[PDB]
Design an enzyme around this catalytic site. Sequence first.
Site, PDB file in Angstrom:
ATOM      1  CD  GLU A   1      -2.723  -1.571   2.111  1.00 56.06           C
ATOM      2  OE1 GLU A   1      -3.093  -0.752   2.904  1.00 56.06           O
ATOM      3  OE2 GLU A   1      -3.573  -2.538   1.765  1.00 56.06           O
TER       4      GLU A   1
ATOM      5  CG  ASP B   1      -6.608   0.668   1.609  1.00 54.55           C
ATOM      6  OD1 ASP B   1      -6.330   0.438   3.129  1.00 54.55           O
ATOM      7  OD2 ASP B   1      -6.309  -0.549   1.039  1.00 54.55           O
TER       8      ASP B   1
ATOM      9  CG  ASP C   1     -10.170  -1.915  -0.370  1.00 58.16           C
ATOM     10  OD1 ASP C   1     -10.031  -0.833   0.677  1.00 58.16           O
ATOM     11  OD2 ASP C   1      -9.876  -2.928   0.723  1.00 58.16           O
TER      12      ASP C   1
ATOM     13  CE  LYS D   1      -8.654  -5.768  -0.424  1.00 56.83           C
ATOM     14  NZ  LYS D   1      -8.895  -5.657   1.133  1.00 56.83           N
TER      15      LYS D   1
END
Lengths: 215, 187
Positions: A39, A68, A84, A86
């Site tokens: 991230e 996020d 998001d 992942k």
Amino acid sequence: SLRSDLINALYDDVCGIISAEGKIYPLGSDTKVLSTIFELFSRPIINKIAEKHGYIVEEPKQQNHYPDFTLYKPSEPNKKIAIDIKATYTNKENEKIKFTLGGYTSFIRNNTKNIVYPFDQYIAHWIIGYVYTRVKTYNINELNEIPKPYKGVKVFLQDKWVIAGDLAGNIGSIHAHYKDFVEGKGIFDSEDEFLDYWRNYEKYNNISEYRNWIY
Amino acid sequence: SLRSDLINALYDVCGIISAEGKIYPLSTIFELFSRPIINKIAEKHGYIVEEPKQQNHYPDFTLYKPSEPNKKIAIDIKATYTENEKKFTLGGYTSFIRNNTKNIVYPFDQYIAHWIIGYVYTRVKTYNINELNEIPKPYKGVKVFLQDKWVIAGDLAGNIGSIHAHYDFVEGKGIFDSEDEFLDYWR
């Protein structure tokens, strides 16, 4: 398109953790540290492309909270994007892989619990996946020796529902190959279908059963 | 004394570093720090270490001499924050403690000791090796301790909360009279 620009920014890594004294500690595929590591590389990218399109970006001040990254043009604040990030691993390059996609008992069923903004306000839910091939400190001069957690990283940007699957692990995603995620070859016909399957998942256990159940 | 060796052996990180030498500014970290230390001392005593194979499973580290399986040690890496002031949480008081065979790696009755490694730090673009100084830290000062779960545990969650005392923890200073009173409360 923020989307095409963004994904083409992702198209073009980690040796360890570094201390103030320049000491490096390798990490090596030991646990969940790799999702946080992923991230981190993305935050900058999501930010440069949004800015170059007049988009705001935001994060869950209230830590644990979906998604996020929340994006939106100030003008039309009501159409918000959910992004998001992942990550998953593959021991065998060219084998099928899996992802997890978030709970189905909360915001998908309630509307407000555990989400930055109410669900109704997000018009798109994108997913950024990384598939990384699984494989005493060090100096700044030892970067090329430090036992790396993986050798190879692959990413894709795809809407959540497209890649959602029909089995819980927290939603499990489809069981396919890197290409099927990029291509967008899931199992649901519509996101309307994806929401309904997961909202009613207390009758059915898999998609065939489900589709029979809607009769 | 493995508790000795351990404590004896028992944290500054301000970024992650890329292959291209770039550095990205920053509770998983403390986890990552303990692992290497926990293992080198145990191999120095003959214990095999084993992490869990699933989420929410006690404990973070199970240790044992293969010839004595019913004398395993459980360790839990715990970390919180303060700047100097007034508390941890300790697994769950619903599962393996009232069950024995649930949510734990081995049956609770195989563990003849349970510990917690505590870290109490203080909270607060890419850079390069020279910029290293300009990198704002994630946490100001970090402290560490090991102590049993029963010695520092008490009131309730709000998992199962420990005491709310001053890093006391190293001194044991808890509220329970024994490990029998500890269990006889949470059970």
